[PDB]
Structures are given as structure tokens and as C-alpha cells.
Amino acid sequence: MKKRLTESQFQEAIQGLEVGQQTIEIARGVLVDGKPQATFATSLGLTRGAVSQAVHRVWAAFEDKNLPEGYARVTAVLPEHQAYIVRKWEADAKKKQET
Amino acid sequence: KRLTESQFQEAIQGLEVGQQTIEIARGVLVDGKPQATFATSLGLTRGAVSQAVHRVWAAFEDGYARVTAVLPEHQAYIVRKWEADAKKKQETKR
């Protein structure tokens, strides 16, 4: 990452999305305001996983609408060395997209 | 087999599930009720119930990191196979 969205991108993300208002507020706070997830867990009395779950739903909604040709979205838990390779792949991807 | 409420609380913190999953897991692992009671009461498959209980138990039992990325399809498929091969390894390990 970082994983960020403008308000305009955020609206596109939730456009026609089945999602509750609390999920939206957390998602907004994390993705467009840039706040850490742990703060929303503490303030709202939610587990860190519930918060992560809310952020992911909106982020995924956006990406699924903005996948370049030949690309796909993945979320997965991986041993650290594999996570390292993914980051490299992600960075390489981004440079090509930019170009 | 079983968990304390203290252990239960600890195990559910990182889980991305709905309250139903959590409540089934409490009933089975903390209060000790059979799984089939929840499949029957709620109208769930036994698989959905076993999966709910397992997620919570595995969280108690268990060099890893969470990644989220958009990649060229060939790499996306590899991540999914890695994840799969990793969970079947963590299934046995020994």
C-alpha cells in the first residue's frame, strides 16, 4: 500500500453497494481521511477484524470497478517471504501502469 | 475442544466475520453445545457451522502477513495457490 481514495472515488466505490452506514464511516475515515484502523476499533467498541472487514469491503468494491485489462484482485494471508514477493510484483505492476 | 470466555475474546479479535459466526463459536467452544444444534436452529449446513467454529479455534491455536493487491492475473492465481498450499500445510505441519 498505501491504500487511499478521494471522496469522488469513495462515492464510486459505494455506488450501488450493499453496505451499512457504520461500515461507510469507518471506510471513509481510513481510506479518504487516512486514519489508522485501530482508532475506529477503540472508539466504536469493535474488533480490529470487524474494522478491517469494513475497510476491505469498500476498497474491494472500488478496485473491482477499476481493474486494468489483464489484472485481478487478491486478498490472502501469506508467510512473510511470499508477502515480500507480492509487494515487489505490486511495485513492478504500478510502474508499468504509470508508464 | 473448549475455550474460556477470556480465550474466546482473544481469538475473535482479528476475525473478519459476522456476529452469527462468533455466536455459533461461543455456543460450541465456550458453552459446550453440539454443532448440530446450531445447524438445526439457524438453518445452516454443518459445513458452515464447522467452518465458523474452526476459524475461532484456529485463531486460538495459531511468520505471516496479510496482503491485498491488484496484480497481473498470472500472479493473482499464484497468490491463491500459495494461500491454499499454505493452509493445507498448516492443517498438518507436525
Author numbering:
A (entry chain A): 1 to 99
B (entry chain D): 3 to 64, 70 to 101
The authors write:
Gene expression in the IncP-1 plasmids is stringently controlled by a network of four global repressors, KorA, KorB, TrbA and KorC interacting cooperatively. KorA is a 101-amino acid, homodimeric, protein with an N-terminal DNA-binding domain (DBD), containing a helix-turn-helix motif, and a C-terminal dimerization region, joined by a linker of four amino acids. In this study, we have determined the structures of the free KorA repressor and two complexes each bound to a 20-bp palindromic DNA duplex containing its consensus operator sequence. The structure of KorA consists of two domains, joined by a highly flexible, four amino acid linker, which retains its mobility even when bound to DNA.
The crystals of free KorA contained two dimers in the asymmetric unit (ASU), each with two N-terminal DNA Binding Domains with four α-helices and a C-Terminal Dimerization domain containing a single β-strand and the final helix from each monomer. The NOEs correlate with the X-ray crystallographic B factors for the protein and confirm that the linker is flexible. The structure of each domain is well-determined from the NMR data, and is consistent with the crystal structures. The structures of the DBD (residue 6–66) from both techniques fit with an RMSD of 0.92 Å, while the CTD structures (residues 71–98, dimer) fit with an RMSD of 2.9 Å. When the protein is removed from the DNA complex, the DBDs collapse towards each other, giving additional fluctuating contacts which keep the protein compact. Dynamic interactions observed between the two DBDs include salt bridges between R57 and E18 and hydrogen bonds between R48 and Q11/Q15. The mobility of the KorA DBDs, in the absence of DNA, is likely to be due in part to the different possible electrostatic interactions between the two domains, giving rise to multiple conformers of similar energy.
